[PDB]
């Protein structure tokens, strides 16, 4: 008997689930990484064409398991009918943004593995621990974590010049709308994409604590208040070819130390690399070298 404790109470599984459905980001990759092809998982809403709806590392693993991708058409929100049609024995939502009502509705379909605290606030190691336990594979989950950690360490050790360059650099992950720079998003330390950076040797600036009290996974702040993040050595943001220059020319954002120094890592918007920034055991293997190279080049400019 599997007992799960999460934000909405307790989920009981009578035995290891035969059929596995997942929702939201990343969860399907934990299953796949453990050798399980989901009977259904959320269509990728970012990093790849909706026509395709599945990220390259996920696709690759599915093929390696001789399986096929069954996607829930749920770009606009949870598709309860589709989930129900997959006839699951468990629904992995260890990393997700489900509400009480969502949890109650899903639970009528099958036992739900929900997040521990607040929506979208599950780090990658915790994602594995929650999801792997719900699969009745807790031990395999621990092993998967150690193996993923070793993959990370291997890339860092293998490239000392990148490792030394980013080590101890104070970093913030942000989302900046090029069309409106009067405000932007900063991701909190409880967001997996912000926390992953610490696995790579970077650290959070002092100013991040100021967001410890934020209830959400990210906080939108005014450019008039951007001085707050002058303590970051390097800044990471989604964007494109024009992003850095537009930022450096911005009358308010251009004054920020890291931006002024050109210490900004621009992740190509809506690409696999962008999507990988919320890491999974599969995405890391696939993208870490590429990611480290972008991070290393940006940290080069930290003064
Ligand atoms: Cl190197």
Whole-angstrom Cα distance, residue 161 to residue 24? Answer: 36
CA-based angle 72:74:79, to the nearest 5? 80
Cα 154 to middle of ligand 1, angstroms: 12
Q: Are strands 171-175 and 183-187 parallel, antiparallel or unpaired?
A: antiparallel
Structure tokens at 18: 């035969």
Residue 288: C-alpha distances to residues 15, 18, 174, 196, 270 (Å): 36, 32, 19, 11, 17
Question: How far is the first Cα of the chain from the last one, in angstroms, to the nearest whole number?
Answer: 55
Structure solved via: X-ray
Cα 26 to middle of ligand 1, angstroms: 29
Whole-angstrom Cα distance, residue 174 to residue 196? Answer: 14
Cβ neighbour number for residue 1 with a 10 Å cutoff: 7
CB 237 within 8 A of CB 264: yes
CB 275 within 8 A of CB 47: yes
Partnered with residue 265 across adjacent β-strands are 236
Give, as residue ranges, everything with CB less than 5 Å from ion ligand 1: 159, 161
DSSP, collapsed to helix, strand or coil, labels residue 226 as helix
Residue 178: C-alpha distances to residues 116, 182, 221 (Å): 34, 10, 15
Nearest CA-CA partner of 174 in 93, 79, 238: 238
Cα 200 to middle of ligand 1, angstroms: 14
Cα 172 to middle of ligand 1, angstroms: 23
- Give just the sign of the alpha carbon dihedral 101, 107, 108, 110: positive
Cα 270 to middle of ligand 1, angstroms: 28
CB 170 within 8 A of CB 202: yes
Cα 235 to middle of ligand 1, angstroms: 21
DSSP, collapsed to helix, strand or coil, labels residue 3 as strand
Structure tokens at 291: 């990611």
Nearest CA-CA partner of 256 in 293, 239, 231: 231
Whole-angstrom Cα distance, residue 88 to residue 110? Answer: 6
Nearest CA-CA partner of 285 in 157, 158, 193, 152: 152
- Give just the sign of the alpha carbon dihedral 271, 195, 2, 140: positive
Nearest CA-CA partner of 73 in 102, 104, 94, 45: 45
Cα 91 to middle of ligand 1, angstroms: 41
| Residue reference for tokens 């521990």 | 116
Do 1-137 and 138-303 fold alike per CATH?
yes
Q: Name the E strands within the chain.
A: 2-6, 9-13, 20-22, 41-42, 71-72, 90-92, 112-113, 171-175, 183-187, 218-222, 234-239, 264-268
Phi and psi at residue 299, in whole multiples of 5°?
A: -65, -25
Of the options 2.60.120.380, 2.60.40.1180, 2.60.40.2220, 3.40.50.1980, the CATH number for the domain spanning 138-303:
3.40.50.1980
Whole-angstrom Cα distance, residue 70 to residue 22? Answer: 11
Structure tokens at 4: 């799960």
CB 120 within 8 A of CB 191: yes
Q: What would the 3-class secondary structure string for 179-219 be?
A: CCCCEEEEECCCCHHHHHHHHCCCECCHHHHHHCCCCCCEE
CB 115 within 8 A of CB 124: no
Q: Resolution limit in angstroms?
A: 2.1
Whole-angstrom Cα distance, residue 168 to residue 182? Answer: 30
Cα 300 to middle of ligand 1, angstroms: 13
Cα torsion for 135, 137, 142, 144, to the nearest 10°? -80
Cα 246 to middle of ligand 1, angstroms: 30
Cα 261 to middle of ligand 1, angstroms: 22
- Give just the sign of the alpha carbon dihedral 193, 226, 201, 117: negative
Cα 236 to middle of ligand 1, angstroms: 21
Report domain extents, the chain.
1-137, 138-303
Partnered with residue 113 across adjacent β-strands are 92
Cα 292 to middle of ligand 1, angstroms: 10
Give the containing element (helix H, strand E) for 295: helix 281-299
Of the options 3.90.1150.10, 3.40.50.1980, 3.20.20.80, 3.40.50.620, the CATH number for the domain spanning 1-137:
3.40.50.1980
Q: What would the 3-class secondary structure string for 138-166 be?
A: HHHHHHHHHHHHHHHHHHHHHCHHHHHHH
Residue 131: C-alpha distances to residues 62, 64, 235, 287, 295 (Å): 18, 21, 31, 22, 29
Cα 186 versus chain centre, distance:
14
Whole-angstrom Cα distance, residue 265 to residue 64? Answer: 33
Whole-angstrom Cα distance, residue 54 to residue 32? Answer: 13
Cα 196 to middle of ligand 1, angstroms: 20
Q: Are strands 41-42 and 9-13 parallel, antiparallel or unpaired?
A: unpaired
Whole-angstrom Cα distance, residue 266 to residue 240? Answer: 7
Cα 234 to middle of ligand 1, angstroms: 19
Residues 6 or more apart whose Cβ sits within 8 Å of residue 45: 75
Whole-angstrom Cα distance, residue 16 to residue 276? Answer: 29
């Amino acid at each position: 008997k599997i007992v799960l404790d999460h934000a909405f109470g307790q989920t009981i599984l009578d035995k290891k689930p035969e059929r596995v459905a997942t929702i939201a980001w990343g969860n399907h990759d934990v299953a796949l990484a453990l050798g399980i092809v989901p009977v259904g998982f959320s269509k990728a809403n970012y990093g790849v064409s909706a026509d395709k709806g599945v990220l390259p590392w996920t696709e690759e693993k599915i093929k390696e398991l001789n399986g096929k991708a069954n996607l829930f058409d749920d770009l606009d929100g949870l598709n309860f009918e589709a989930i129900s049609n997959s006839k699951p024995d468990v629904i992995l939502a260890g990393y997700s943004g489900i509400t009480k009502e969502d949890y109650d509705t899903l639970s009528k379909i099958a036992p739900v593995a929900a997040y521990k605290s607040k929506p979208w606030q599950t780090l990658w190691r915790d994602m594995i621990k929650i999801d792997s336990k719900a699969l009745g594979m807790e031990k395999e989950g621990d092993e998967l974590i150690k193996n993923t950690e070793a993959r990370i360490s291997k890339e860092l050790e293998k490239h000392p010049e990148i490792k030394g360059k980013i080590k101890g650099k104070k970093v913030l992950f942000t989302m900046i709308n090029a069309a409106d720079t009067s405000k932007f998003w900063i991701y909190t330390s409880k967001d997996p994409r912000a926390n992953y950076l610490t696995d790579l040797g970077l650290v959070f600036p002092e100013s991040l604590k100021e967001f410890e009290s934020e209830d959400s996974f990210a906080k939108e702040i005014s450019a008039e208040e951007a001085n707050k993040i002058n303590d970051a050595d390097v800044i990471i943001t989604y964007g494109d070819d024009k992003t850095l220059e537009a930022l450096q020319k911005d009358p308010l954002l251009g004054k920020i130390n890291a931006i002024k120094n050109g210490a900004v890592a621009v992740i190509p918007d809506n690409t696999p690399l962008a999507a990988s920034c919320t890491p999974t055991p599969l995405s890391i293997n696939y993208t870490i070298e590429e990611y480290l190279n972008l991070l290393g080049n940006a940290c080069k400019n930290a003064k």
